[PDB]
Amino acid sequence: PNFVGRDADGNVTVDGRSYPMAESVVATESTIHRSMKEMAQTLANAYKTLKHRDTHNKGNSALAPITDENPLIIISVLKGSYIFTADMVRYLGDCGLPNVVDFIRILDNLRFTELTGKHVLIMEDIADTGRTMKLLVEKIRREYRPASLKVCVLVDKPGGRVVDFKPEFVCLTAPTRYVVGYGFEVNDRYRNYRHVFVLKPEYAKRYPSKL
Amino acid sequence: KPNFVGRDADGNVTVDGRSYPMAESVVATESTIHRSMKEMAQTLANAYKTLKHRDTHNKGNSALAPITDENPLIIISVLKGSYIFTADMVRYLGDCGLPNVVDFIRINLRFTELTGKHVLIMEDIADTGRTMKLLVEKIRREYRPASLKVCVLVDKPGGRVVDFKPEFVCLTAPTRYVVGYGFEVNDRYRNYRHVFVLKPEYAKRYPSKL
Ligand SMILES: Nc1nc2c(ncn2C[C@@H](COCCP(=O)(O)O)OCCP(=O)(O)O)c(=O)[nH]1
Ligand SMILES: Nc1nc2c(ncn2C[C@@H](COCCP(=O)(O)O)OCCP(=O)(O)O)c(=O)[nH]1
Ligand SMILES: [Mg+2]
């Protein structure tokens, strides 16, 4: 239960802390985690009874269920999705969905090599124009041809989509503005904030120097 | 708040009613781990609050600059196991008001302006110490930072056979193989909210390749 207000200077405050960069709040921490917990229940319901090719015992030719021996493959997209993935896989643990996480950069390579015929779920933190995920779903499809490939996003910005891509799973929806907080950044700043805000346009270019 | 630890009808470890058949014992529950990290967030905040390092945000200011949103503390997390530890930790550092940024290394960085900066490595385990001794020596050589300290989630000082000691330690464990909360056996059990001693029978349970 977070309390959103304004300080004496007119800056947005969440639970008494001032966020001078924020214009408004998109979702407080309680809203974000309430969404991810229901999302984990949704994913678990969508994947628990499924079957895919057994990479555990290479000698078995029948298709195996999703267990700790043949878990769900989760591809987290660096950089901003690591906080989202961290909370998410623990929620999937609560719903008892066995899973494994490998990371990719948008480019640093995957290290998993047994994706063919496997159920695969990519976890990105935002879809805006839809380009980044359209290229990623096409690349993974042709390099590995999994059994299923689906996208779960923390934040969908539908109003700014240019290509035609939809995430199968969406935690939050956001307005067509630049957001920061909880993985979203401005030159890596505000990534560790526990809520998602709309950034003041005056702050969009405040840290131009390269890290 | 505190997690309840017991045993089920078959002697398996239970935490809050959920059974963990691969576990031998519980090193630390989620609440113990989070109380520790929250106290480390205070400790790190007191250590870096008043420091100063090179001003890269305004390269025309030859004077040193405090740790701000313009020149934050550089934090290097190592992948993969330490990403969950890092995710919780940076948020705790947010509550303690310590401005920081995180880039990841695996054993490739993308940050390059580390010289004259305060840098802190986030790792989940220090046992023999070889992996961390190699990293600090290589970063001091290729970056010449102002300071370079190490914060680890679990320290196993009975296992060290090489000269290295982390300046910041959340938990101290015996010389045993742990799984849970970042720690794994062939990428399993990473997402469990607690840290368990692994049964030696489960050590070679998933030999196949991912
Ligand atoms: N911080 C922030 N970044 C945004 C946003 N929208 C797009 N981006 C850029 C981008 C966010 O990823 C860059 C941040 P990174 O994870 O640290 O590399 O989203 C891709 C949009 P696409 O699906 O049209 O390809 C936003 O609202 N806030
Ligand atoms: N799961 C698990 N792995 C352990 C453990 N100890 C060392 N390792 C291996 C290792 C960490 O494993 C790396 C695997 P990743 O983090 O998933 O990429 O730690 C080396 C410590 P040292 O070089 O200072 O001696 C342990 O207790 N549990
Ligand atoms: Mg490790």
Residue numbers in the entry:
A (entry chain A): 9 to 114, 130 to 234
B (entry chain E): 8 to 114, 132 to 234
Verbatim from the authors:
For example, T. brucei has three 6-oxopurine PRTase isoforms whereas there is only one 6-oxopurine PRTase in humans.
To explain the mode of binding of the ANPs, crystal structures of HGPRT-I in complex with compounds 1, 2, 6 and 7, and HGXPRT in complex with compounds 2 and 7 were determined. However, the structure of HGXPRT has not previously been determined. The guanine bases in 1, 2, 6 and 7, bind in a similar fashion to HGPRT-I and HGXPRT, being held in place by π-π stacking interactions with F166/Y201 (HGPRT-I/HGXPRT) and forming at least four and up to six hydrogen bonds with the amino acid residues and a neighbouring water molecule. In all six complexes, a phosphonate moiety is located in the 5´-phosphate pocket. In HGPRT-I and HGXPRT, this pocket is formed by D117 to T121 and D151 to T155, respectively. For compounds 2 and 7, we have determined structures of complexes with both HGPRT-I and HGXPRT, thus allowing a direct comparison of the binding modes of these two ANPs. When compound 7 binds, the phosphonate attached to the linker binds into the 5´-phosphate pocket in both complexes.
